Structure 1
Amino acid sequence: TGDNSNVVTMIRAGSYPKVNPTPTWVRAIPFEVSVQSGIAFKVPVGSLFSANFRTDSFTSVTVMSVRAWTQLTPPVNEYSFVRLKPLFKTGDSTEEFEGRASNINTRASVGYRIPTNLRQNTVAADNVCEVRSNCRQVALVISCCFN
């Protein structure tokens, strides 16, 4: 009931309720991946299941959106860039969403949203997307629903 109350008070409990010891969880997971120049890196869904994110008890996840930022400085004379290519078990996309920095000292960023019709579960062996960048590390923040 909120408060103003300074002592323990009785709750008039009823019948035993429906319960669930292992619920779902909506999250924004931050992690980094190492990228090599001119080579696409396939980001594994397995990266989302870890004690470091309190998610090692889940075996599936529904990804809703993916955002990426360059995480280290770009090569001399260049502006940072990052590209994302969505991957799906039913058929990979060929879109190459790209963000470029406008100040050499700033991160490049881009993201993409997955439509409802493509929001099925993915497991550790599946891949989320392909990342390309002129920077050696890319930081991702993935919005998803663990279940």
Structure 2
Amino acid sequence: NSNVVTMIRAGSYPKVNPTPTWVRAIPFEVSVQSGIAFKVPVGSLFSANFRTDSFTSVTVMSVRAWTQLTPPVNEYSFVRLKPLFKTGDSTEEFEGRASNINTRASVGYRIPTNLRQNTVAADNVCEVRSNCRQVALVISCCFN
């Protein structure tokens, strides 16, 4: 430790980078209608509300989802996630249901390394299906 300023015997000018990368977990919500599949846009990840308005591309690694609102009467919450890729969309429907009507329904999926390419704002991450009118998403990604 130290209680005062001390000198740093610096050397040659190093290698710098003013705009580095940033591995993040981005939370946001999306509105979803009953029976309709909603495509989650990558553009929602680029925002000043996430300190990411300086990025134009991102490498998505894994996506998790939670039901943000209450389900219809008598029903338990559920949520489905169909991954989407520019080289070819998937037909998986990773679904998670709540065992309590008062609790959220959670599910997610991980993108393999071979499918971890950049995605711009115009692309889509996945489709979401749910009986609740809003879904909360947390996306672990690598902004670059």
Secondary structure of 1:117's partner? helix
Q: d(CA) in 2 for partners of 1:90 and 1:28?
A: 24
1:79-127 deviations in Å (ceiling 9; x for gaps): 0000000000000000000000000000000000000000000000000
> Shift of the alpha carbon at 1:43?
0.3
Secondary structure of 2:59's partner? strand
> Shift of the alpha carbon at 1:132?
0.2
Q: d(CA) in 1 for partners of 2:88 and 2:2?
A: 58
Which residue number corresponds to residue 23 of structure 1? 20
Secondary structure of 1:18's partner? coil
Secondary structure of 2:81's partner? strand
Secondary structure of 2:54's partner? coil
Q: d(CA) in 2 for partners of 1:104 and 1:95?
A: 25
Secondary structure of 2:129's partner? strand
Give aligned-pair identity as a percent.
Answer: 100
The CA RMSD measured in Å over matched residues stands at 0.3
Secondary structure of 1:46's partner? helix
Q: What is the aligned residue count?
A: 144
Q: d(CA) in 1 for partners of 2:95 and 2:18?
A: 41
Query: Following superposition of structure 1 onto structure 2, how do residues 1-147 of structure 1 map, counting pairs within 5 Å?
Result: 4-147=1-144
1:33-80 deviations in Å (ceiling 9; x for gaps): 000000000000000000000000000000000000000000000000
- Runs (5+) with no aligned partner, structure 1: none
- Runs (5+) with no aligned partner, structure 2: none
Q: Which runs of 4+ in 1 moved over 6 A?
A: none
